[PDB]
Amino acid sequence: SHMCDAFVGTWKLVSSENFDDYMKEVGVGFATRKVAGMAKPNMIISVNGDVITIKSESTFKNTEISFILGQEFDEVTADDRKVKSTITLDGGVLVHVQKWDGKSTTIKRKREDDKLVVECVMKGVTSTRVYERA
Numbered sequence: 001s002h003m004c005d006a007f008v009g010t011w012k013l014v015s016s017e018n019f020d021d022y023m024k025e026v027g028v029g030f031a032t033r034k035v036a037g038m039a040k041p042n043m044i045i046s047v048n049g050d051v052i053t054i055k056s057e058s059t060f061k062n063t064e065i066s067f068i069l070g071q072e073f074d075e076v077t078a079d080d081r082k083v084k085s086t087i088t089l090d091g092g093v094l095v096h097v098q099k100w101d102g103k104s105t106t107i108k109r110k111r112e113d114d115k116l117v118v119e120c121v122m123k124g125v126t127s128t129r130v131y132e133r134a
């Protein structure tokens with residue numbers, strides 16, 4: 001057992017707060033905000049050795065990242081940003097920073113009770129998304 005055992009699984013979105021405001025702050029356009037905001041994605045997290053894979057499956061877009069903690073990688077986000085990302089573990093929380101066009105956003109994934117709670121921050125705007133086991 002190891003680094004991210006309590007994150008591994010299939011997690012389904014059950015609540016979201018302020019995600020439209022988060023997306024506006026990020027610079028996402030109107031049509032993508034409306035269609036992406038409808039989706040109820042599954043977040044599928046797995047680990048093989050040092051490599052963590054996080055897939056997002058949704059009616060909007062399917063995406064996938066695989067990474068090693070602390071090691072920067074290229075990511076294409078579901079809204080089509082080309083970002084440079086680094087994900088670390090800080091006190092048991094996965095902390096994901098995306099950098100692009102001189103901007104930055106931080107996404108934190110934490111296990112709380114039987115949920116995976118995702119906090120998404122862009123400047124002064126926070127969105128909280130809660131996922132449950134599928």
Ligand SMILES: CCN(CC)c1nc2c(c(-c3ccncc3)c1-c1nnn[nH]1)CCCCC2
Binds near residue numbers: 028043058059062107
């Ligand atoms: C903040 C990180 N993150 C939330 C965990 C997401 N960021 C984004 C998007 C989605 C998204 C993917 C698939 N379908 C609908 C939405 C998600 C997501 N991934 N998994 N669940 N929501 C695209 C909309 C624009 C902003 C970027």
